[PDB]
Amino acid sequence: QKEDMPPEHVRKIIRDHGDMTNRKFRHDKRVYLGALKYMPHAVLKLLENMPMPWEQIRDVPVLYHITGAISFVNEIPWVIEPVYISQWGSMWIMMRREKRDRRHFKRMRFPPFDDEEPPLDYADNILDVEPLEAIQLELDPEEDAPVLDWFYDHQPLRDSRKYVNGSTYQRWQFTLPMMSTLYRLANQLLTDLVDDNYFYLFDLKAFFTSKALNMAIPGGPKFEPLVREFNDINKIIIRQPIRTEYKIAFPYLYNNLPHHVHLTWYHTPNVVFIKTEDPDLPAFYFDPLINPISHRHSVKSQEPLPDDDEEFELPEFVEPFLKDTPLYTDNTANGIALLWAPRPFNLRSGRTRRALDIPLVKNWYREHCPAGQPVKVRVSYQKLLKYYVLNALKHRPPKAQKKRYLFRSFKATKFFQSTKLDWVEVGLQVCRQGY
Amino acid sequence: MEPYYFVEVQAPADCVSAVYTVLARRRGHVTQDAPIPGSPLYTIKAFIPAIDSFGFETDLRTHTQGQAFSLSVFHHWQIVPGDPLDKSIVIRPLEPQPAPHLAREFMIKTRRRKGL
Amino acid sequence: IGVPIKVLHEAEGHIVTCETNTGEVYRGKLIEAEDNMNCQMSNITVTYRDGRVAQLEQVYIRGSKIRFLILPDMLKNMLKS
Amino acid sequence: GKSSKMLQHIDYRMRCILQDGRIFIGTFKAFDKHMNLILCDCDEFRKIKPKNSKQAEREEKRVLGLVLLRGENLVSMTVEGPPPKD
Amino acid sequence: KAHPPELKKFMDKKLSLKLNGGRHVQGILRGFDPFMNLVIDECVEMATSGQQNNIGMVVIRGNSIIMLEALERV
Amino acid sequence: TKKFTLMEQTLPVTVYEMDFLADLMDNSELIRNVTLCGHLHHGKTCFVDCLIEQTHPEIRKRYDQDLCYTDILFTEQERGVGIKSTPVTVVLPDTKGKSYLFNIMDTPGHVNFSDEVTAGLRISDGVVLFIDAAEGVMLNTERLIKHAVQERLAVTVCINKIDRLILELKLPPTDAYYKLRHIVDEVNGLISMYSTDENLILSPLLGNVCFSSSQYSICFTLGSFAKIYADTFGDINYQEFAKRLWGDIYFNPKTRKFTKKAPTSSSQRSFVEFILEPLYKILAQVVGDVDTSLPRTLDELGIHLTKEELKLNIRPLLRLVCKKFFGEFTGFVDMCVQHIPSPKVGAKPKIEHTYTGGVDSDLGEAMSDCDPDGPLMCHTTKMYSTDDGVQFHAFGRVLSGTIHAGQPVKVLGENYTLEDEEDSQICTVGRLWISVARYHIEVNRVPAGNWVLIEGVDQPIVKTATITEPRGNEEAQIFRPLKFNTTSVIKIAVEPVNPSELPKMLDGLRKVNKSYPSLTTKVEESGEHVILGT
RNA sequence: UGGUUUCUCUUCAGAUCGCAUAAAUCUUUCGCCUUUUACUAAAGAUUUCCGUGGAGAGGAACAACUCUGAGUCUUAACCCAAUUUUUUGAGGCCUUGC
Ligand SMILES: Nc1nc2c(ncn2[C@@H]2O[C@H](COP(=O)(O)OP(=O)(O)OP(=O)(O)O)[C@@H](O)[C@H]2O)c(=O)[nH]1
Ligand SMILES: [Mg+2]
């Protein structure tokens, strides 16, 4: 295998190859121009691995040309999804607590360096400086105990074989205290919807039925027409005005010509989940939100009572099955709470996802909103709903190809080496290379 | 004679008042508002007109954000309060007529429908 | 509990033939078969050792005093064992 | 050790000898603790077990069918022929 | 195990009992135990001669019970 | 392609049964015709899904839901309803082991689809009611109690979703026992109001009412749990132990016996303790103790999960633990076989309310004998569609005689009477189908008591008709038309857009009229098409 | 009747996924509208890119093994003597059949 190079090699290559005005490197003047056609791609990886405001420094692997023509970042950011949502909920809490508790928040100047300023060298201006404190909310050592040791690492439990596999960082396996702690760290970014009966006329198939017709929903998206002596008005009882949502709820019965219409899932059994307040109360008790039973019956039915002189007694070696075990532990109510939880948090184990592929604010624009809000945010929620419907509609399946691996074919050549570098150093390199 | 529909709605507590409003806007007369024993949801049993019951489910689940849920069976026939034969009352073309002449309106519409 | 015993219980409700330890042959409907091979039957034809037949409505034979039973072939299709 | 001595002969055609001296030949499909036996396509012989008796091989043969024999009344068993494929 | 014989259906019914030794008796079932020992009331010995003689209430050991037949409908 | 009936592709991997199925068909008292009804969606399909998942191994494993068997269409599979009364038939054993033959009619639960439930209920001699444990008695529950008491069948209920007591409501065991007893008492009250008969009262001690959570494959009667309890432990009479479990009955740990009051020291019931204590232990140790102390619980129950099986999420792991603890669905087999009159007994009260004439000396005794011979008669009521084919098969049950393939058929209609033989006509059987819901398979003959699809007789059977022998001196009546729980009220005026294809539209309208049992498609004097629905 | 982390290659997989979501080409309407690009917003037909899965091969171990849990001659003390079974109500005799 081609192995990692010392990080000073690419550094001195970029330092010697300056503004490419030296005569000595004129033979490389051609090569750099060709590397221009990969500068979009080298941009993408550069911004794909941006380091996450709870991080001070991220070291990324770098695939670099031997002349210093280009620097690619050869890494996909796998970010395990419950930990990612908990960390951004932590960021949400800290930023609200900072913006309320700061006398004057000075905004950054957005052309940060001046136009005629040459870019700063990493090796002297940045390499020796201690970075800063990151954001990284203070965690309770007793209440946030199974999370506190690893919660603000880059790829947190990576070298622990009990919780993930290896260093490819692909499959995670947590415990229910970990999932409980990640769940109550992320309450600021999650919802309180236990069942999807909220989305009766406001879900995906309903919006497809709306786009197939000319109908809009009052809190939903608006589209373009997909198609662009019987109904006598003295023969029709207009008793109730035909409310427009009937055309979604029952599409064939209330319209003529329902072409390209989608059927709607219309009811789930109402999930009735009692949220417990304190652990002083037991795990499952009769909650005072539940209506009592109070049995009443008129005449007693003759249910069987095998009376005395039946002489049926149990043997000595028999007991109730699990009377040795207690009825409930301190982790029972938390696990029942983890049963009705959003899709990352309702499970023990899964497969890692990219930082790209995790929408933090998707559940916020998917629900309809309380009217007290301004006009601006209502139009914005409607447009984001329209974007979600256009994403879900024109989804052709992934079309299984032959895998191509551009960066594996670059580092199989003799023109590319590989190292590991600070993200800020590679970003300064990419800016100098594109310039 | 008008057909009526027996409607059972399962709903949360503020949705009980929401069901009461939506069902009372359709000449309702809610029959029973008993709770469910062993559940925090309430059962609302009621009668409804069956001309007023085209989309009561959809309107109800829209107004209650999908919390309340409604089903409807046929069991009943009782008298339309209007005078079915009345030449004094003139029926408007499109405007919905009130209670004193609903039978006249419905008879004129069914007369114009097939029989003449 | 024995494999043959399960197959016997399977024949409950079917017409079966039973020979006793004394060679009397009882044919009719098996109502109940116990674990020990005790057999309740109904509407019997009995064929004695001399060859003569008789008819009985209801019988019960002790398992120990049964030599064997013939069951339908409907059952033959416990092939796991 | 192996328990196989019965399980080996399972599915085979088997010649079983009863305490009165009858010969039951059927397909050995199941047994148990008591040696209660399950015999498919079973016939009963009385007079002989043929070793090619030039006069005839078969007298007093009766077709029985599917037989459950109680182990109390079993004496012995030998292999009569291979399993039918069916 | 230690099972009962399923004979409650036959309780207080007249029965015909075939015993070992080619012996036959008739009487009313008054009770039983797990060994199939029986109590038979108003019992009558059916002698091989054809003659029948009343022996009253008796115990039959289940060991020697070949077969029973109900003379009633159960 | 004009197929949307979801991949029939017949490959059953049932365990050692082909001939056995038709062998149990030929017994006529070893078959049970059950119909299953619920208020709306109360778990009936996932129930029959678990039953067939018991039935068919090495395939047939469902992940994150199935419901294919009673939900084989594509509009049906997306709405959430079961719109059809899709039947199924299987063989599956008892606590003893004698496998019976079950014809499960799997009805809709929606109020507007009571037609399907009625048509299934008339052909099956037993009804099984499903009530959500967290709901109680509901609208269509009471409506189908009415319709089941009226059309003379045995009645038995099965309380489903008892996990929602545990995991959603989070009730104590005593309060959840109170709620289950309340549901049973409300069922007995609704039955006692309607039935003038008294020998139909249901109680858990009797054995007919069951308890079965169906996403996790729990199903226990008191006999089934007692059979588990006795198969683990010694030689307890599990029937006599099961008799003394439900209802105000306590275990005294000194005298080792069941009393009515005698420990009054804040004890719990026999049901509460013995049933709901270990069940809540299993549920709680799965949902909250999977990492710490779950194998310590599993070693106390004889349950051995592998390394791969322990790494599941809480829903499949909970289902797998409850499958390896409860095993088969034999309590349902107990409440069926011990309480459904298998169609020797079932013949008489059915034929005294279906047949027009009566008990009389020609037809009645031949029906109630129900031998597969003699006056060949049936009753087809459902008309099930093929995917592409114009022909849609009849579905009925053979009362007397058999049906052979190629045997010709006189279809007595419904406007037919005894002295009016112009409605009826004669046809010939195309094929005989017996269906496993997601699969179909041919038979050469169907004896008496069994359900059957008929191919090729579809032209005279609009909604209700009877099947008999052709040109035979056997002259009889027709069974009565379908009395319905609801009356069809909603009238829809209908007219085509293009008036150039009235015959094709009337053809498809006649076909959907033949499909649904209460669809009423007529033409009034003004010449506009009228569809009456529920 | 019994043992896995990482790198590369090949091959097969997208009719309920990649529980996420971009751009392009064509053809047909459009929508503005000085003309061409750059575009509006729909339907359809196709592709590219960022990702993914199953199997096989090889390399880099920085994991450690074979009286071991399971045997084809070892190893779950319990399937080992009172009527339903593995410990005989047995014993005796005689006639018939090639
Ligand atoms: N909590 C819980 N939910 C269940 C259980 N069984 C089924 N469900 C859910 O309840 C809903 C109804 O299930 P179905 O069986 O499809 O409905 P049904 O009872 O057949 O009634 P139809 O929909 O009319 O066929 C489905 O979403 C199931 O996933 C259960 O045991 N517990
Ligand atoms: Mg020009």
Descriptive overview:
Chain E: Residues 2-74 form the Sm domain. Chain E: Keywords: Cytoplasm, mRNA processing, mRNA splicing, Nucleus, Ribonucleoprotein, RNA-binding, Spliceosome. This is part of a larger assembly, with 1 copy of chain A (435 residues), 2 copies of chain B, 1 copy of chain C (81 residues), 1 copy of chain D (86 residues) and 1 copy of chain E (74 residues). Chain A is 28% helix and 5% strand. Chain A has helices spanning 7-16, 29-35, 39-48, 81-100, 122-125, 176-185, 204-212, 246-249, 332-339, 362-366, 375-393, 406-410, 423-434; strands at 59-65, 71-73, 171-173, 349-351, 416-422. In chain A, helix 3 packs antiparallel against helix 13 (423-434), helix 4 (81-100) packs parallel to helix 6 (176-185) and helix 6 crosses helix 9 (332-339). Chain B is an alpha+beta fold. Chain B is 29% helix and 27% strand. Chain B has a 4-stranded antiparallel β-sheet. In chain B, helix 1 crosses helix 2. The two termini of chain B are 20 Å apart. Chain E has a single domain (1-74), classed as SH3 type barrels (Roll). Helices cover 0% and strands 54% of the residues of chain E. Chain E starts with 13 loop residues before the first strand and ends with a strand. In chain E, 23% of the residues are buried. Chains A and F meet through helix 9 of A and helix 6, helix 7, helix 9 and helix 10 of F. The structure holds guanosine-5'-triphosphate and magnesium ion (MG). Chain A binds one RNA strand of 98 nucleotides through helix 3.
The helix content of chain D is: under 10%
Structure ligands: guanosine-5'-triphosphate, magnesium ion
What's the order of the H and E elements of chain E?
Answer: EEEEE
Rg for CA atoms of chain E: 12 Å
Secondary-structure content class of chain D: mainly beta
User: Outline of chain D, from the CA principal axes?
Assistant: globular
Q: Roughly what fraction of the amino acids of chain D lie in strands?
A: over 45%
Radius of gyration of chain D: 13 Å
> What class would the helix/strand composition of chain E place it in?
mainly beta
Largest sheet entry of chain D: 5 strands, antiparallel
PDB class: splicing
Keywords: Human Intron Lariat Spliceosome, splicing
Entry title: Cryo-EM structure of a human intron lariat spliceosome after Prp43 loaded (ILS2 complex) at 2.9 angstrom resolution
Chain A: Pre-mRNA-processing-splicing factor 8
